[PDB]
Design a protein around this motif. Structure first.
Motif, short mmCIF file in Angstrom:
data_model
loop_
_atom_site.label_atom_id
_atom_site.label_comp_id
_atom_site.label_asym_id
_atom_site.label_seq_id
_atom_site.Cartn_x
_atom_site.Cartn_y
_atom_site.Cartn_z
N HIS A 155 0.83 -1.19 0.00
CA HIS A 155 0.00 0.00 0.00
C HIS A 155 0.87 1.25 0.00
N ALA A 156 0.44 2.26 -0.75
CA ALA A 156 1.20 3.49 -0.86
C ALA A 156 0.90 4.39 0.33
N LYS A 157 1.93 4.65 1.14
CA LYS A 157 1.78 5.58 2.25
C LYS A 157 1.76 7.00 1.71
N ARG A 158 0.75 7.77 2.12
CA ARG A 158 0.55 9.12 1.59
C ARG A 158 1.47 10.10 2.32
N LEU A 159 2.75 9.99 2.00
CA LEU A 159 3.78 10.82 2.61
C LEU A 159 3.90 12.14 1.85
N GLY A 160 4.87 12.95 2.24
CA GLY A 160 5.11 14.23 1.61
C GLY A 160 4.66 15.38 2.49
N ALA A 161 4.81 16.58 1.94
CA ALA A 161 4.45 17.80 2.66
C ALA A 161 2.94 17.89 2.83
N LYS A 162 2.51 18.31 4.01
CA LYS A 162 1.09 18.50 4.31
C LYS A 162 0.71 19.96 4.40
N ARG B 63 -2.04 25.63 13.69
CA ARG B 63 -2.20 25.51 15.13
C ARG B 63 -1.33 24.38 15.66
N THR B 64 -1.15 24.37 16.98
CA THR B 64 -0.30 23.36 17.60
C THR B 64 -0.88 21.96 17.40
N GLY B 65 0.01 21.00 17.20
CA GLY B 65 -0.37 19.61 17.07
C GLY B 65 -0.76 19.16 15.68
N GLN B 66 -0.64 20.02 14.67
CA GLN B 66 -0.96 19.64 13.30
C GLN B 66 0.28 19.18 12.55
N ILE B 67 0.08 18.17 11.69
CA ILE B 67 1.18 17.58 10.94
C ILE B 67 1.66 18.55 9.87
N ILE B 68 2.98 18.68 9.74
CA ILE B 68 3.57 19.50 8.70
C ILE B 68 4.29 18.68 7.63
N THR C 295 7.75 12.05 12.09
CA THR C 295 6.74 12.96 11.59
C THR C 295 6.87 14.32 12.28
N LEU C 296 6.92 15.38 11.49
CA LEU C 296 7.02 16.74 12.01
C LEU C 296 5.64 17.29 12.33
N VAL D 236 12.40 23.00 8.67
CA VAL D 236 11.09 23.62 8.81
C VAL D 236 10.97 24.22 10.20
N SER D 237 10.14 25.27 10.30
CA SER D 237 9.92 25.96 11.56
C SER D 237 8.52 26.54 11.54
N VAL D 238 8.03 26.93 12.72
CA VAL D 238 6.74 27.59 12.85
C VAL D 238 7.00 28.95 13.48
N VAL D 239 7.10 29.98 12.65
CA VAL D 239 7.28 31.34 13.14
C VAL D 239 5.98 31.80 13.79
N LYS D 240 6.00 31.98 15.11
CA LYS D 240 4.81 32.32 15.88
C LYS D 240 4.12 33.54 15.28
N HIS D 241 2.80 33.64 15.52
CA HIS D 241 2.01 34.78 15.04
C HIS D 241 2.75 36.09 15.25
N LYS D 242 3.39 36.23 16.42
CA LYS D 242 4.20 37.41 16.76
C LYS D 242 3.46 38.71 16.48
N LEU D 243 2.13 38.68 16.52
CA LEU D 243 1.32 39.88 16.33
C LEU D 243 1.87 41.06 17.13
N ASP D 244 2.19 40.81 18.40
CA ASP D 244 2.82 41.78 19.30
C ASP D 244 2.24 43.19 19.12
#
Ligand SMILES: [K+]
Ligand SMILES: [Mg+2]
Ligand SMILES: [Mg+2]
Ligand SMILES: [Mg+2]
Ligand SMILES: [Mg+2]
Ligand SMILES: [Mg+2]
Ligand SMILES: [Mg+2]
Ligand SMILES: [Mg+2]
Ligand SMILES: [Mg+2]
Ligand SMILES: [Mg+2]
Ligand SMILES: [Mg+2]
Ligand SMILES: [Mg+2]
Ligand SMILES: [Mg+2]
Ligand SMILES: [Mg+2]
Ligand SMILES: [Mg+2]
Ligand SMILES: [Mg+2]
Ligand SMILES: [Mg+2]
Ligand SMILES: [Mg+2]
Ligand SMILES: [Mg+2]
Ligand SMILES: [Mg+2]
Ligand SMILES: [Mg+2]
Ligand SMILES: [Mg+2]
Ligand SMILES: [Mg+2]
Ligand SMILES: [Mg+2]
Ligand SMILES: [Mg+2]
Ligand SMILES: [Mg+2]
Ligand SMILES: [Mg+2]
Ligand SMILES: [Mg+2]
Ligand SMILES: [Mg+2]
Ligand SMILES: [Mg+2]
Ligand SMILES: [Mg+2]
Ligand SMILES: [Mg+2]
Ligand SMILES: [Mg+2]
Ligand SMILES: [Mg+2]
Ligand SMILES: [Mg+2]
Ligand SMILES: [Mg+2]
Ligand SMILES: [Mg+2]
Ligand SMILES: [Mg+2]
Ligand SMILES: [Mg+2]
Ligand SMILES: [Mg+2]
Ligand SMILES: [Mg+2]
Ligand SMILES: [Mg+2]
Ligand SMILES: [Mg+2]
Ligand SMILES: [Mg+2]
Ligand SMILES: [Mg+2]
Ligand SMILES: [Mg+2]
Ligand SMILES: [Mg+2]
Ligand SMILES: [Mg+2]
Ligand SMILES: [Mg+2]
Ligand SMILES: [Mg+2]
Ligand SMILES: [Mg+2]
Ligand SMILES: [Mg+2]
Ligand SMILES: [Mg+2]
Ligand SMILES: [Mg+2]
Ligand SMILES: [Mg+2]
Ligand SMILES: [Mg+2]
Ligand SMILES: [Mg+2]
Ligand SMILES: [Mg+2]
Ligand SMILES: [Mg+2]
Ligand SMILES: [Mg+2]
Ligand SMILES: [Mg+2]
Ligand SMILES: [Mg+2]
Ligand SMILES: [Mg+2]
Ligand SMILES: [Mg+2]
Ligand SMILES: [Mg+2]
Ligand SMILES: [Mg+2]
Ligand SMILES: [Mg+2]
Ligand SMILES: [Mg+2]
Ligand SMILES: [Mg+2]
Ligand SMILES: [Mg+2]
Ligand SMILES: [Mg+2]
Ligand SMILES: [Mg+2]
Ligand SMILES: [Mg+2]
Ligand SMILES: [Mg+2]
Ligand SMILES: [Mg+2]
Ligand SMILES: [Mg+2]
Ligand SMILES: [Mg+2]
Ligand SMILES: [Mg+2]
Ligand SMILES: [Mg+2]
Ligand SMILES: [Mg+2]
Ligand SMILES: [Mg+2]
Ligand SMILES: [Mg+2]
Ligand SMILES: [Mg+2]
Ligand SMILES: [Mg+2]
Ligand SMILES: [Mg+2]
Ligand SMILES: [Mg+2]
Ligand SMILES: [Mg+2]
Ligand SMILES: [Mg+2]
Ligand SMILES: [Mg+2]
Ligand SMILES: [Mg+2]
Ligand SMILES: [Mg+2]
Ligand SMILES: [Mg+2]
Ligand SMILES: [Mg+2]
Ligand SMILES: [Mg+2]
Ligand SMILES: [Mg+2]
Ligand SMILES: [Mg+2]
Ligand SMILES: [Mg+2]
Ligand SMILES: [Mg+2]
Ligand SMILES: [Mg+2]
Ligand SMILES: [Mg+2]
Ligand SMILES: [Mg+2]
Ligand SMILES: [Mg+2]
Ligand SMILES: [Mg+2]
Ligand SMILES: [Mg+2]
Ligand SMILES: [Mg+2]
Ligand SMILES: [Mg+2]
Ligand SMILES: [Mg+2]
Ligand SMILES: [Mg+2]
Ligand SMILES: [Mg+2]
Ligand SMILES: [Mg+2]
Ligand SMILES: [Mg+2]
Length: 88
Positions: A15-22, A30-35, A56-57, A79-87
RNA sequence: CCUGAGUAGCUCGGAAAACGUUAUUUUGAGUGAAUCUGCCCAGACCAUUGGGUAAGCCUAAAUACUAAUUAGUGACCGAUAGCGAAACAGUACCGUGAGGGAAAGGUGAAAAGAACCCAGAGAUGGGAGUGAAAUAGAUUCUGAAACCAUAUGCCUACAACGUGUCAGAGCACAUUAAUGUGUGAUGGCGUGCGUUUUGAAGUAUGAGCCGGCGAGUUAUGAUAGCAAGCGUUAGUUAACCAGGAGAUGGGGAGCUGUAGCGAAAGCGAGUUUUAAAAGAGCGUUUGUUUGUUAUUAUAGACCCGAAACGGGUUGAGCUAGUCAUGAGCAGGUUGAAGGUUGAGUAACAUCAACUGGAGGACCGAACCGACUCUCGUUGAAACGAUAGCGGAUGACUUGUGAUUAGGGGUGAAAUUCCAAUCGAAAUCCGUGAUAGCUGGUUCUCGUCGAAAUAGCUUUAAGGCUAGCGUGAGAUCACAAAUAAGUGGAGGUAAAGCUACUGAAUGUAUGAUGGCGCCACCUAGGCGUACUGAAUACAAUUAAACUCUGAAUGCCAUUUAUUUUAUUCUCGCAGUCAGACAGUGGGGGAUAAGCUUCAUUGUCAAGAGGGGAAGAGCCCAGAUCAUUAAAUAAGGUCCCCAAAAUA
RNA sequence: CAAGGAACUCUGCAAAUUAACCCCGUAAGUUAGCGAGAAGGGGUGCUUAUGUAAAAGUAAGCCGCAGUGAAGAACGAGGGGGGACUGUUUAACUAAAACACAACUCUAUGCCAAACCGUAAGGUGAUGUAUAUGGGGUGACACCUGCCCAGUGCUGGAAGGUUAAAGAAGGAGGUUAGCGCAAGCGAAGCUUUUAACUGAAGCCCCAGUGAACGGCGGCCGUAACUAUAACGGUCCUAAGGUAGCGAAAUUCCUAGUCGGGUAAAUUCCGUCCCGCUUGAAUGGUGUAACCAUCUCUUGACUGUCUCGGCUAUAGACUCGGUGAAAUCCAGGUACGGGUGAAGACACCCGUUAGGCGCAACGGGACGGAAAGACCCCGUGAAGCUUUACUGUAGCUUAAUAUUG
RNA sequence: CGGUCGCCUCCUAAAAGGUAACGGAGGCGUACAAAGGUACCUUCAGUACGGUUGGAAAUCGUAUGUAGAGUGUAAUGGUGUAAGGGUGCUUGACUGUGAGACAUACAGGUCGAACAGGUGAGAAAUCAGGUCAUAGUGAUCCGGUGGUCCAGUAUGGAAUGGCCAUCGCUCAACGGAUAAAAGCUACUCCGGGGAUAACAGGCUGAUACUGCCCAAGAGUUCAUAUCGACGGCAGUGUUUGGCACCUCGAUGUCGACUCAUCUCAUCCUCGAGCUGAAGCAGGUUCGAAGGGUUCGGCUGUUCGCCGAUUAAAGAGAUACGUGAGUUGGGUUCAAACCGUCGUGAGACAGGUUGGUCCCUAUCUAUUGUGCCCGUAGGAAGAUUGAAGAGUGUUGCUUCUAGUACGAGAGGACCGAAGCGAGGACACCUCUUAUGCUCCAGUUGUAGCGCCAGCUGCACCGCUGGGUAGUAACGUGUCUAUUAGAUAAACGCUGAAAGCAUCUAAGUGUGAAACUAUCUCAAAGAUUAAUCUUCCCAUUUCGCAAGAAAGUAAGAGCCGUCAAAGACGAUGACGUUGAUAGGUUACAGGUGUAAGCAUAGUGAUAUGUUGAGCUGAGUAAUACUAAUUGCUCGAGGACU
RNA sequence: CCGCCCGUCAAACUAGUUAAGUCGUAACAAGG
RNA sequence: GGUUCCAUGGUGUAGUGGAUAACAUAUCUCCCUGUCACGGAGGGGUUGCGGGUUCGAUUCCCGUUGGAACCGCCA
RNA sequence: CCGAUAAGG
C-alpha cells in the motif's frame, strides 16, 4: 494450439503511504498539526516544531510555517513555525 | 377414620411451550414415594414466607364457517368482462384412464315472418303487400379497421426508388373562404420503429396486417416533504356499545412528547469513565393526531418464462417378463442312435445287408424378423413402398385370460421397455416454486441532467459505501472559481559519470597470470604472439546510477473580478461492460481498430458544416418561423455556392 | 447399349453372371459329424418305334440363332481378424467383436438353510435337501494358467494394549440446625457435579488366503577383428513378467527392416523384436464347422466407369374443377470500386438497365425450419461414482425388561 | 492445467499526493531484560610504514583517508560527535486520559501538544507512555481464566450472567459463507452470452514466401556466366501465429464429384539480352495470362512416394469457391473392444467395427421464350452496325541436310509438305446404339363351339432383325492466314555534352499479348438509324392530330399442320387448296404369307412364292377435315 | 593328476570342422 | 512448450537441517601357494558449473548445463 | 572347505 505459458513470480506491491508535505509555506497552523510525513528525516525540525515515533514533524505553537535551506552545499532542509508574533 | 399409586418424582432417548429442551407440561424403556406436623408450586437448588390441593367426570354464553331458504344492497361485471358455464356447460371435443376442457345473447310496438307476379329446376333474386322504417327480412340492434372489388379526376412503359421532404409546371375542381383542394412532368436532400450495446441502415435481435385484452396494486407498519386541527402538565384514542352496512357520541386501556447518563444497581441538569470535581463522551429542549405524496419492510409484490423438487392418484388393451388354456408351421431332401440277420471272435471288439426315423439338421412358401440400395422426409405412412435378405420342429410363432407400477416394475443387458414420451411414466396438488438471467412495461409539456471510477465482496453479467445528478434549506466571505504577482515542497525531461553503483573504448606507465628459457627442488630470475589490477589523458551507457537539474503541474498567501455555490444537512436516484484522437509510458516486436495506466477533448447522452461516403479527427453547440445579412474550419474549371491579378 | 471390363469409388455399394430336373465328377483341412449343391461339366423341344400300371429312359428322324424357348428358382476360389456354434439386443439412425449359451472355477448354504419382496404377517427358494440352491468371474474343444500375502478385502487366533452405554467405592460444592464477640467452622436432610473400578464387539497385534481388489525394476563392467554380453558387482522392492504371442482391434517414433502379391501397394500375407505401454480365468495360445460380421487378392460377370446415347410409362408442362404450406417491418428490390458494427438491393463515386409474364437452374438475400446440441457464464437442474461431508435402512455386539 | 490470493520496500509512476496489468526485483507472519530509558565518555571501514609465533588478511603503534564502516533484517530514506561503540544506575516495554491533525467508503490505521497520580536517570535544565523509520498480523459469534463498589426471577444465599483484563483460529481463499463437504457425465437438461472460444471474415505481419541493397568468397585465372556469406531494406497476405471487432432467437466445418472464374511471382507454347553459348541439349534474366496444363497403385485424405506417358503435368485466390448442386470415406452423438490413466463412475489430436445429410424458389443474378407499348400515318420486306459474345492448344515423320558447326562422336537456325492427339460445329451416305400400334420365329395359359389360323396376358412374354427419327463409337469441317499499333530487344541519322550516343526532333524492326481479319447475334442503339414497295387521301355539322356516319394495305380470332415447338412464338396452308388423314404407286425393312397340291406313318419338306405384311419414309390423287364467319386496323402536329 | 576332459556363450568356413577366446569343473581315483 | 527429481572416489549408492563425508566393489603393497583364483593383514582414493548469504557452503538461495520422470487437453 | 593349469614338438 496453446503451447502452454510460463508463470510469473513477482506480482506483489505494498500500500502506498501518503507521505510528503502536508502544510505549505506561509499557511497558518495551530499546535499539534502535521507539517511533514516522511520515512527518515528528509526535513529537519527547527523552532516550535517537534518529532514523533515515525519521524513525523508536527507543530508546537501557533504561527506561520517556514522552510529554510541550510547545511553543506544547501542540501539540508529545515522547517519551523514562526509564531504569530502579532505583538500589537 | 377417608380425601383418586405403577400415580407424583428420578434415570435414559424425544417432544409442548416464544425458547434450538429447560424451571413448568407430556411420554417410549427402567425404577419408584408420603398421607394435613401430608403433597405440589413461586425458571437450577436449599431454608424462611406465601399460594394451591395432581394422579375422577360433565359443563350453556360470548367464538369459527355458509352448500341452502327469504328480503335487500353495491362510486362490482355487462358477452375477450362476470362463475369454466347468460344458450340444453362440465356439454361438444381430447385421452385406455385419472384428468384436460371451449365457442356461441339482441328482428320488429305487434309476425302483421312477405299472399300474389316475373326469371330460374329450386334455393334465391327483382317487384307487390304489411310496417313509421324492409339498406329493420329470419345472414335479423349499432356495424370500425385490416382485406377484396367498382368508378369521377391526376400521374405512370430510358427507369436505380426506407417511397418521404423542400421547391415546381401542367391538368381537374370549388371549401369548416382559407396567401383553397386533388394528382405530381421535373430539380435539391434523404440508409425504418422498438430492444440491447463503446458502437446497429444492419449480414444482430422482435413484430405478416387489423381490432380487442395485456405489466407498479392492496392490507399492516417505518421514515421524509407538504397542509390542516389542537397546544405548552400537551396531543390522540384501540377494542367495544348506540346510530341508517352512516358522519358521530360514549369508551383515556394505552401510545408519543415532557430529563438525561450509565451494562446495571443508581444518580439527576447532571451523568458515565477515573483517585479526580481535572480532561473527554452524552445531555443542559422544541410537541402531537390526521390527510396527501415519495421511498421502504412482510406478504406472489411490475408482468411473462424454466430445467426441476415433494405429496397423492391413473395406467401391463402398445411393449418386457411370468403363469393358464388353445391354435399354426404348404412342399421336398440328408438318413443318427438303436434293433434284426450274416461273417467274424475261444467269447468280445469289428465289418456287411435290412429295418428305424433322430437332429436347437438342409432347401424353400404361409408366418416371424428387419441386413442393403433407391424413393419418401410440409410423406400414402409421427418409420413405410419396390427389389433383394435371415430364421422357418424350435432358446419357434400366435390368439384369449391373469399378473408384476414409478427414489418402482421388466430386462439372453442397449440406459431396453413400461400407451407415438423414460438417466427414470402420465395427471392433479404444494404452486402464482425459484431465476443476481433474456424479453416486455401503455398520455403530454417544461427545468436540470450523469456514470461506466476507488475499496470490500465464494465477488467479476450481481450487491454495499464513497465519487458524479437532482429537489429543499443554510453559509456572503473569512467559501468556491477566473487572471496577475510572491513564497515553498520535489529530483522527472535534460545532462553528467574522476561524484558513487554496475556496463564499457583507445593511448601511456603497468600489479597479475598464461607462455617460455635457465638455474634450483625451492627461494627464484630474463623476455613475453599475449591476459589484464591501479594511475593519467581523451571519450561512452542506465526504469530500479546521481556531484547537478528545469519548465509544466501542486500547496498557500496577496490584489482585482465573478457565483451562493464545486462547502455543510436532509429526501430520491442512476452508474460499477466504455470507445476513439493527441500527448508521456508499461506489456507486445517502436505490430495490431491489441491490452493496461496518467492527462487533454469528442462520442456515449449531440444534430449542423469540412473530410466523397465515416459515433470518437477539425470548425461549433439545434427554443420555433423567415426564399434576410456578416463569418469559423474548408474551398472558388464542371459535377457544386464562390477569384482574380504578379 | 457397339469396343474395353472395376480403369469408377472410402469399399465390386448398386447392378450384372449362375439358377429347376436328370446324368458324370468333386480337393486341402477336420473334433471324422462335415467341408459339399464343393470346384468343374453335359442333356432338356417336336414326331415315330421300343419301353412301363404310369413313367423315366433308349434308338431313328425333323425344325429354329436359341428347346426348364415365357414366370419362379445358388455367382465362385484363396488368405487373415473376432466370436466356438443355433440364438438375443438399443419399437423409430448403431444387429455387431456386444449379451446370452452348453462348459470351468471360486464362494455361501445342514433346512424354520443361505439369498430375496415387505414394516410385518406371508411368500419365492422348494412341496427341493450338498449329485441341492444363491452369488462372483471365465465362456465349445485341445494344451496351459507362472512369481508376490508388502497395502486392501476375507477367514481364524491365545493371551496383551485402547474403547461406548450402563453399574458403581468414594470425592468436591450449594443450603442451614447448631457452635462461635466478630471472623469463620459446621450434623442430618435434600440438591449440583465429578469419579477409581467393572464393562462386549470393533481397532492395534499374530498367521493363512490370488480362478480375492491388485502388483509383477534399474545402473556398471566383461569373450583374441569388430559387434554383443553367456558372466561378475551393486541399489531398492512384498516379489521385479514365467510360458505363449508379438508393429497386434494393442507400436508413439512408424508409410519400422526384409520377402510375397502389382507396371507401380500408408491397405493385405509371412518374418524379424529397444513389447515407450503384450501376457496367462477382467484368462494366454491354437482350432474343424458357422456368420445379412470386418479385412485383402482373384475368375466369370456386367453402363460402377472411359462416355455418354435411345425408347416407354407416371409426373413435371398446357387446358377444365377443388384448393394448402412454412415465411412475411413497409418496399417501386441492378452491377463495379470504396466506405461502414470490420463481407451492402438501399450509403459515396461511376457503369448499365423500356413495362409485365412463362419455363428452367440454384449464386446471393450472412435464405427457411430448430431463444446453438460444441465453448463459456449461473454461488442452475438431474443421473452416476468414491477412503468428499453429514446422516440412515439393513447386519453385528453389549446393558436392561419380559426372566425362574 | 500451471501460478497467485494478507502485509512491507524500490521501479514502472510522467520532480505534490494518488495511479493498473498473469509488469520488473525482493522480503515478512519477527528479534532484544538489552539491541529499551537516562547520565557521562568516545568515533569509521580500508590502505601505507614499522614489528616473534602469525601466514594476503587476527593484535599493536603512527599516518592517511571524508563514508565505500556501523545502524539485528528485504529494500528505500536517514544518520559520520549522529540515531554508531563502551560504562554506571535503572524498568516510562507506566496508570487515567487526551485538545488538534494525517489518511481514509465503512470497519480500522498513524502522529500528537497538554493535564492528574506515582517513579527512573541526572547537580540541574530536561528526557522516558518501547527500539533510526516504514512489514512481524485476523473482525464478529462461542466458550474458558483472573479481578470486581453491578444484577441475583417472593425473601437470604447459590446457580447464572454483567463490566474490565486475558486465552483458544497457515478462519493464509488472510473483511473470515457452515462446527462439519471430493469427482464424472459422449445418457444429459434449463436460463443466457459473440460480455467468451472452435470455421470463415476483419486488423497485425512476428513467422512464412517473393524481391532488392553491400561484396567476403567459390568459380584453369576472374566478386557480379552461375552461386552468394556475415548484415540491411522492402513487397505479398501466402504457412505457423497474435488481438477478440461481426455472427451462439444457428455463418453447416475436411476430402471427393460437377462447373468453373480470376491474379502472375510463367510449367509448355511465343519474342529477346548475357553465358564458363562450337552444334544438339542447357543455365539465368527481361517481355508475355491467348490457349493448354494426363492417367493410375497405396491412403478419407490435401499432401506425399512410386509406375507409364506428355510440349507441359505451374504457384495461388475466390467463406482454405462450390451440401436451398451430389456423396458422407474422415472428424464429432448414442453401441462395443484393445493399449494407457483413474480406487471409482469415466477419460485419451491413441487404435478399431457400426451408425437419419430436410426445403414445392418470393426478390435479385443468370440461361431461353413470350405479351403490351414506344420508335409520331399505318403495314410488308431488305439492310448498315454503336455496344458485344464465341474459338485461339499442340505433337510426330519426311525434305531442306548428314548441309551449318564439330578432331570426332554427334548434329542445326530459317522454310515447305504429309499424318495425328485433345477441343469445337454440323450431319446421318457408310459402321454402330436405340427404335412399346413394323416383320419373322417361339413357350405357357384363356378365349374365337373344334382342326388350322388369330387375339388377351406373362419385362414390349422371350429371341433374331429393323423404316423414319434421335445420337456417337461413325464422317465432313474448324483449331489458318494477313494488316495496323506495340511490350522486352535491336536499330539508322543525329545533338544537348565538337567525341560518343536507339531519342530530345525525324525515321524504322519487333510476340500465341492488343485492335481487326473468322463465326454468331444485334436500331428498346429511347442517341430508337437507312433503303424499297403498298394503302389512306370522303359527305355534312363545326371545330380541327374536333365530331356523326365513311373510306384500304395489313394483322389477329378460328381450323389443318411440322422444316418448329414446355406454353406462347417460328414457318406452310385454309376450297382460287395438296396443310393433315384416307386411297393409289413406290422405296426401305422383314424373309417365301394363308389356302391348296405332292411326299412322308408323323413331326416336316417341296411348288404356287423374292410370296405376304408393313408406324412415321417418297410422290401423286380433293375422297374426308381446313365453312358461306368475326374483330382490329388509315389521312400524318407544327417548326 | 602342474594328467585328462565335458557342455553353454562368442568368431569364421562348409551339425561338423577349425594352434594358443570367455563361464564353470560334469566324467576318469571312493574324481572328492 | 510447462512442471517435479537427480549430479558424492574408477563404478553402484548413503549421509550432513552450515563447522564432519562414509558402505560395498574396484585399486595398491605384503602373507598365501609350483603357480594362479579364492583367502588373510595393511594401505590408500570424493560433493555438476556459476553466482549470492554467513566468519565458514556439498548442505542455505537464485541462475546455467547434462540425465530422467510427468503432463501438454475442449473444440 | 578344497576350483583351475596356452600350442607344436
Ligand atoms: K456463433
Ligand atoms: Mg510504495
Ligand atoms: Mg417447537
Ligand atoms: Mg397445607
Ligand atoms: Mg425462586
Ligand atoms: Mg387431592
Ligand atoms: Mg364467457
Ligand atoms: Mg366474442
Ligand atoms: Mg370419450
Ligand atoms: Mg328486399
Ligand atoms: Mg356478415
Ligand atoms: Mg346488422
Ligand atoms: Mg417516359
Ligand atoms: Mg439512355
Ligand atoms: Mg447512383
Ligand atoms: Mg436513398
Ligand atoms: Mg416503447
Ligand atoms: Mg450485444
Ligand atoms: Mg459487442
Ligand atoms: Mg439491409
Ligand atoms: Mg444470429
Ligand atoms: Mg438477443
Ligand atoms: Mg421476425
Ligand atoms: Mg369513535
Ligand atoms: Mg433348423
Ligand atoms: Mg429425492
Ligand atoms: Mg451407455
Ligand atoms: Mg413408447
Ligand atoms: Mg411465473
Ligand atoms: Mg436460483
Ligand atoms: Mg442542459
Ligand atoms: Mg467518463
Ligand atoms: Mg476514470
Ligand atoms: Mg451475476
Ligand atoms: Mg535521461
Ligand atoms: Mg560510471
Ligand atoms: Mg508502448
Ligand atoms: Mg502504448
Ligand atoms: Mg481498444
Ligand atoms: Mg449505454
Ligand atoms: Mg456530429
Ligand atoms: Mg460530411
Ligand atoms: Mg441552445
Ligand atoms: Mg461574405
Ligand atoms: Mg459554380
Ligand atoms: Mg457395353
Ligand atoms: Mg466384351
Ligand atoms: Mg481403384
Ligand atoms: Mg481414382
Ligand atoms: Mg450385392
Ligand atoms: Mg470351401
Ligand atoms: Mg495370426
Ligand atoms: Mg456369433
Ligand atoms: Mg445368427
Ligand atoms: Mg434402431
Ligand atoms: Mg438397422
Ligand atoms: Mg414350497
Ligand atoms: Mg466374457
Ligand atoms: Mg476370450
Ligand atoms: Mg494368475
Ligand atoms: Mg500376513
Ligand atoms: Mg514367435
Ligand atoms: Mg480401412
Ligand atoms: Mg502380418
Ligand atoms: Mg487375471
Ligand atoms: Mg491368438
Ligand atoms: Mg452376422
Ligand atoms: Mg397423365
Ligand atoms: Mg474498412
Ligand atoms: Mg441461447
Ligand atoms: Mg451449486
Ligand atoms: Mg509522485
Ligand atoms: Mg506528477
Ligand atoms: Mg538495510
Ligand atoms: Mg538505540
Ligand atoms: Mg460457533
Ligand atoms: Mg432469589
Ligand atoms: Mg478476501
Ligand atoms: Mg440451451
Ligand atoms: Mg466479440
Ligand atoms: Mg511486411
Ligand atoms: Mg569472369
Ligand atoms: Mg498490407
Ligand atoms: Mg503461398
Ligand atoms: Mg477489449
Ligand atoms: Mg462476419
Ligand atoms: Mg435470425
Ligand atoms: Mg439459417
Ligand atoms: Mg445451408
Ligand atoms: Mg512478368
Ligand atoms: Mg488476337
Ligand atoms: Mg485462408
Ligand atoms: Mg471449402
Ligand atoms: Mg482450392
Ligand atoms: Mg487457418
Ligand atoms: Mg451453396
Ligand atoms: Mg458440399
Ligand atoms: Mg439435399
Ligand atoms: Mg445455402
Ligand atoms: Mg462415417
Ligand atoms: Mg454409411
Ligand atoms: Mg460409448
Ligand atoms: Mg487399474
Ligand atoms: Mg447494350
Ligand atoms: Mg441411312
Ligand atoms: Mg390350335
Ligand atoms: Mg551512332
Ligand atoms: Mg509494325
Ligand atoms: Mg422523353
Ligand atoms: Mg402427308
Ligand atoms: Mg405358303
Amino acid at each position: 494450439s496453446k503451447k502452454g505459458v510460463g508463470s510469473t513470480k513477482n506480482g506483489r506491491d505494498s500500500h502506498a503511504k501518503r507521505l510528503g508535505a502536508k502544510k505549505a509555506d506561509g499557511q497558518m497552523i495551530r499546535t499539534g498539526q502535521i507539517i511533514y510525513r516522511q520515512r527518515g528525516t528528509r526535513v529537519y525540525p527547527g523552532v516550535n516544531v517537534g518529532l514523533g515515533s515515525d519521524d513525523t514533524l508536527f507543530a508546537l505553537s501557533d504561527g506561520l510555517v517556514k522552510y529554510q535551506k541550510f547545511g553543506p552545499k544547501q542540501g539540508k532542509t529545515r522547517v519551523s513555525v514562526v509564531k504569530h508574533k502579532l505583538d500589537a
